[PDB]
Amino acid sequence: NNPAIKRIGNHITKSPEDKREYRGLELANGIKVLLISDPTTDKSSAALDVHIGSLSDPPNIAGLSHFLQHMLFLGTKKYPKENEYSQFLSEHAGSSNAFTSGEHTNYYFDVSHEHLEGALDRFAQFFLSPLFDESAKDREVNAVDSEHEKNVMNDAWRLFQLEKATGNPKHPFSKFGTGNKYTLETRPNQEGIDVRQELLKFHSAYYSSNLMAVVVLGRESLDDLTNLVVKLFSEVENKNVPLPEFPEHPFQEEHLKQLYKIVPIKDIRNLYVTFPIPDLQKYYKSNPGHYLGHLIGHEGPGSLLSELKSKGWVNTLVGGQKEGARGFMFFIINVDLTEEGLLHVEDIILHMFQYIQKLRAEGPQEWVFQELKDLNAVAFRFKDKERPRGYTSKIAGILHYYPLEEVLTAEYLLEEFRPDLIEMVLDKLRPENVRVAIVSKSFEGKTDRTEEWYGTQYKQEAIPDEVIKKWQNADLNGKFKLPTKNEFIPTNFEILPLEKEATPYPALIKDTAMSKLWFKQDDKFFLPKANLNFEFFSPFAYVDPLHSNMAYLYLELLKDSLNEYAYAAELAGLSYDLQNTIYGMYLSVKGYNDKQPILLKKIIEKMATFEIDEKRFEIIKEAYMRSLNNFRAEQPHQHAMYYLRLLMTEVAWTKDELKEALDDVTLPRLKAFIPQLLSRLHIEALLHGNITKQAALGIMQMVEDTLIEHAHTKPLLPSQLVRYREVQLPDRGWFVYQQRNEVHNNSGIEIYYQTDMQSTSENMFLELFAQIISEPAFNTLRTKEQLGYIVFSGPRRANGIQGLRFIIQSEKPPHYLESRVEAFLITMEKSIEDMTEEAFQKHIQALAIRRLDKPKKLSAESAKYWGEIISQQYNFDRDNTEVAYLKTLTKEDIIKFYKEMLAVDAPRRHKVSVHVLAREMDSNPVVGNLSQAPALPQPEVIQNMTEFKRGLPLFPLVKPH
Numbered sequence: 001n002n003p004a005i006k007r008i009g010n011h012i013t014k015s016p017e018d019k020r021e022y023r024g025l026e027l028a029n030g031i032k033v034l035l036i037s038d039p040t041t042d043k044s045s046a047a048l049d050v051h052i053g054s055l056s057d058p059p060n061i062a063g064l065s066h067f068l069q070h071m072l073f074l075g076t077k078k079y080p081k082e083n084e085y086s087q088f089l090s091e092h093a094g095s096s097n098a099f100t101s102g103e104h105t106n107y108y109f110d111v112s113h114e115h116l117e118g119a120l121d122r123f124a125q126f127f128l129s130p131l132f133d134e135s136a137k138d139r140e141v142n143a144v145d146s147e148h149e150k151n152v153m154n155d156a157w158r159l160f161q162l163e164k165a166t167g168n169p170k171h172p173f174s175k176f177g178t179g180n181k182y183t184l185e186t187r188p189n190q191e192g193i194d195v196r197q198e199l200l201k202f203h204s205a206y207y208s209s210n211l212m213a214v215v216v217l218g219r220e221s222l223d224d225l226t227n228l229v230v231k232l233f234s235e236v237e238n239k240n241v242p243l244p245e246f247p248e249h250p251f252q253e254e255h256l257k258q259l260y261k262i263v264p265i266k267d268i269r270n271l272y273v274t275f276p277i278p279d280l281q282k283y284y285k286s287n288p289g290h291y292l293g294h295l296i297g298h299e300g301p302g303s304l305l306s307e308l309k310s311k312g313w314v315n316t317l318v319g320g321q322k323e324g325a326r327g328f329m330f331f332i333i334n335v336d337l338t339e340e341g342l343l344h345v346e347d348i349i350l351h352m353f354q355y356i357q358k359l360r361a362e363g364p365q366e367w368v369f370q371e372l373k374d375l376n377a378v379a380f381r382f383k384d385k386e387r388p389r390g391y392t393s394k395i396a397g398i399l400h401y402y403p404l405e406e407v408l409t410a411e412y413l414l415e416e417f418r419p420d421l422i423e424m425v426l427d428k429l430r431p432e433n434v435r436v437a438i439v440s441k442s443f444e445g446k447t448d449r450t451e452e453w454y455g456t457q458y459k460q461e462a463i464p465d466e467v468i469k470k471w472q473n474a475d476l477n478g479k480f481k482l483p484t485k486n487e488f489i490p491t492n493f494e495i496l497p498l499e500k501e502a503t504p505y506p507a508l509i510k511d512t513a514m515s516k517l518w519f520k521q522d523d524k525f526f527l528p529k530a531n532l533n534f535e536f537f538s539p540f541a542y543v544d545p546l547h548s549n550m551a552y553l554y555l556e557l558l559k560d561s562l563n564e565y566a567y568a569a570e571l572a573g574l575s576y577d578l579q580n581t582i583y584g585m586y587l588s589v590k591g592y593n594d595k596q597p598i599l600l601k602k603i604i605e606k607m608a609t610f611e612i613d614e615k616r617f618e619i620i621k622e623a624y625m626r627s628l629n630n631f632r633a634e635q636p637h638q639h640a641m642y643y644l645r646l647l648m649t650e651v652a653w654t655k656d657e658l659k660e661a662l663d664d665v666t667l668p669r670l671k672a673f674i675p676q677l678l679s680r681l682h683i684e685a686l687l688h689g690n691i692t693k694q695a696a697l698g699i700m701q702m703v704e705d706t707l708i709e710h711a712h713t714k715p716l717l718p719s720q721l722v723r724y725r726e727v728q729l730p731d732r733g734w735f736v737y738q739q740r741n742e743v744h745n746n747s748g749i750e751i752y753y754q755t756d757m758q759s760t761s762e763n764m765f766l767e768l769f770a771q772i773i774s775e776p777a778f779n780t781l782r783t784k785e786q787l788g789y790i791v792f793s794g795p796r797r798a799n800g801i802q803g804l805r806f807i808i809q810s811e812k813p814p815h816y817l818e819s820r821v822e823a824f825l826i827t828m829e830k831s832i833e834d835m836t837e838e839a840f841q842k843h844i845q846a847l848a849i850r851r852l853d854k855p856k857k858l859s860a861e862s863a864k865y866w867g868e869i870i871s872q873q874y875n876f877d878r879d880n881t882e883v884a885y886l887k888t889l890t891k892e893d894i895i896k897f898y899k900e901m902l903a904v905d906a907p908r909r910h911k912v913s914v915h916v917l918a919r920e921m922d923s924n925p926v927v928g929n930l931s932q933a934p935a936l937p938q939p940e941v942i943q944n945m946t947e948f949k950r951g952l953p954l955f956p957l958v959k960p961h
């Protein structure tokens with residue numbers, strides 16, 4: 001029949017738990033398509049992935065295909081308004097994004113389900129007739145510059161591009177994918193290039209139907225989705241472009257047996273070991289590099305990390321196969337280094353080769369392959385249902401690699417045992433084929449090369465033949481054993497029947513001095529899993545900086561010592577999260593419920609009978625100090641957000657206070673602190689999953705009883721269950737706090753307009769206003785004025801209080817940023833005046849859909865409940881209630897809200913601004929074609945955070961529901 005469709009796939013294998021319906025197909029023009037039908041979904045979604053990317057940039061215009069990616073959002077022939085796509089998503093509860101990697105350009109969106117077609121029609125135009133408007137091109141190249149700029153001082157981006165700079169310079173692998181204003185405007189103008197033509201050429205040459213894959217997920221029937229896709233995409237034109245390939249490895253003989261010493265921005269010590277390998281992707285049914293990676297990166301007893309860590313050389317290890325492109329891959333073993341480790345690199349590498357030699361000695365092990373195959377089969381039977389935007393984007397990228405019928409399963413199911421491929425990859429991991437990189441500040445001033453894009457200081461040297469040889473002669477070492485059978489592999493999957501008195505919301509089913517237990521048997525997803533959440537309260541976790549430090553150090557010591565044993569639980573889908581909070585501790589255990597009370601008991605029992613190892617303590621202390629220091633290198637906006645948390649919360653210790661207090665933490669002081677920490681606690685828990693009320697009360701009591709037995713824990717007093725308050729700003733005040741980022745050459749600013757306490761009405765005024773401004777703020781402060789790449793607006797909530805915040809990071813100074821934000825607010829008040837009733841109801845409706853969007857997986861529903869509980873507002877039915885009220889609001893309500901709390905001459909404006917100056921600006925003059933900025937008041941400049949808090953009231957806390 002149908003001329004537009006080349007073929008329709010057979011049944012797409014799915015999990016028997018997956019209620020979604022599926023149909024793959026190839027259009028006549030060669031687009032591979034997956035259609036997904038989910039008649040329950042609140043948001044629909046599409047993605048498109050083009051098998052072209054950075055590796056195919058013209059050598060003379062680096063960043064082109066990334067730049068192209070930005071430009072597609074900026075208008076098409078059919079929809080020429082620059083921001084028609086974004087504004088349309090925004091008005092319909094949607095969102096979009098896109099990335100560029102060396103081989104792919106991947107675009108995706110989601111939207112309210114009622115508006116799939118609308119969104120999809122705008123979206124399809126990207127691939128048909130983008131405008132590449134000339135003035136948009138001139139504007140947007142700044143966003144790309146900014147994007148690169150945020151990366152320049154990031155250690156992972158520096159290392160990522162350094163590796164490319166050290167392979168064969170002629171290989172496409174050495175290209176600079178991001179681009180910047182120099183590569184995409186300046187050098188091009190100099191060399192007489194018309195970038196608008198170059199974008200049109202590149203779009204035209206590579207954006208061919210035969211290199212595309214599309215996924216669409218909506219409520220529509222499979223057939224309705226089919227007609228929609230055929231209608232919007234079969235006009236994409238087939239230019240029959242050959243898929244790029246890269247058979248020649250970027251690392252040839254000259255590039256092997258090399259050592260690189262590199263200077264980090266942060267104080268971090270790492271060792272990176274790499275081997276070039278062939279492309280293993282075609283072997284996906286057997287997956288030799290995953291097998292080798294599971295072994296070499298294992299963390300249990302017998303393992304490489306185990307030895308390295310006992311010797312006190314390393315704390316963490318990553319091992320396995322790394323993506324390259326079509327034609328080449330890499331195999332990596334990477335570790336972090338202790339101060340001792342750094343002096344023993346030759347030896348750490350030797351142990352790496354001994355462990356590899358052990359694998360050669362034992363040969364391939366079917367039983368290990370079996371274990372990996374079983375785990376993966378279980379991961380797949382019971383995978384959490386995904387959010388549509390990521391799912392589509394992810395599936396779009398893999399329609400390029402697997403038959404239609406296998407796209408769901410291809411990355412999970414294992415079929416073939418291949419001792420031959422396993423041997424073959426193992427014979428590549430040899431010292432003659434090795435590359436070695438060491439990162440340490442100790443190389444400060446001893447380097448002689450500079451990487452062009454990032455500025456990285458490094459030195460390159462042949463590894464001495466004597467060293468290659470000592471490595472080639474790696475002997476067996478008896479500290480290394482293959483792992484043994486994994487006892488945490490779950491086998492019990494029954495979904496307990498829903499109990500007669502089971503509730504829609506969690507229920508308070510235990511209310512004692514020691515503990516408060518919220519509980520909900522899962523009535524939605526029906527996977528054999530559960531989430532067990534615990535807040536442990538204790539005034540001794542945050543009483544001062546020394547205690548905060550200790551709470552941290554203790555819990556890190558605890559995790560380091562459970563690691564070897566927890567890691568099996570982790571391979572088996574049972575994981576845990578354990579950290580110190582400003583109120584005490586937080587513990588979360590999630591995964592397959594089968595073996596979960598076993599891991600829970602081991603954790604509480606380790607925690608309350610813990611014995612510290614002097615060697616591990618000194619190593620972790622030093623790491624903690626670096627981590628505290630390394631804050632100086634986070635980015636300006638992160639700094640701005642951080643200082644604002646310090647200014648506005650009643651109690652908060654600074655990184656400076658914590659560093660200072662850390663030299664005073666001693667083994668004996670820590671040994672004392674723990675029993676003290678645990679002597680009086682209150683526990684608030686949410687147990688949510690495949691479990692009964694009786695199992696839940698049981699698990700809770702098991703945690704209490706363990707602490708009672710081993711730490712003699714007694715209940716805390718209700719009065720000592722103290723939450724911190726937010727600083728209460730004065731009607732008409734404006735305060736400014738200013739600092740310098742010493743590393744990055746950009747500013748950051750956070751601006752907080754504080755409104756009032758959270759409550760149904762104040763929540764929906766703020767939230768509605770934020771919905772209405774959200775997209776325009778992006779479109780004004782970034783798309784048009786191009787202030788920076790990071791531009792953000794939205795509700796701030798803390799400590800029961802709220803307001804509107806702006807976060808921008810920019811080359812322009814903060815005083816200027818502030819002036820444009822104020823300009824924009826005026827604009828928004830006129831915009832709300834000029835807007836139709838219906839435009840207003842649309843915003844209501846879009847917020848409404850956002851707030852009502854149902855969780856698709858257990859842990860998302862747990863998150864919502866956990867939010868109600870740690871905030872102690874306990875408003876589990878908040879979404880229906882808040883929306884009921886929203887729907888009642890009017891244009892006049894929001895104008896009044898703005899005029900009272902937000903306008904520049906508002907009677908109750910409460911403003912605080914953090915300015916973070918870039919490395920090289922020296923004063924900040926704190927006050928200062930384009931919209932007119934109002935005149936601002938002289939701000940009170942904050943000199944001292946503590947004084948500032950002393951001199952202001954504190955808000956009440958929010959009464960519980």
Ligand SMILES: N=C(N)NCCC[C@H](NC(=O)[C@@H](CC(=O)NO)Cc1ccc2ccccc2c1)C(=O)NCC(=O)NCC(N)=O
Pocket residue numbers: 066069070071073074086087090096097098099100147774775778783789790791
């Ligand atoms: N609220 C609306 N309407 N805007 C949606 C924001 C999407 C934006 N995405 C992008 O900047 C790029 C993706 C990327 O950088 N690839 O290289 C894609 C893009 C997308 C939408 C466009 C919309 C109009 C004009 C040009 C656009 C170009 C984004 O993710 N920024 C990252 C962010 O969240 N910053 C915080 C940080 N990184 O810490």
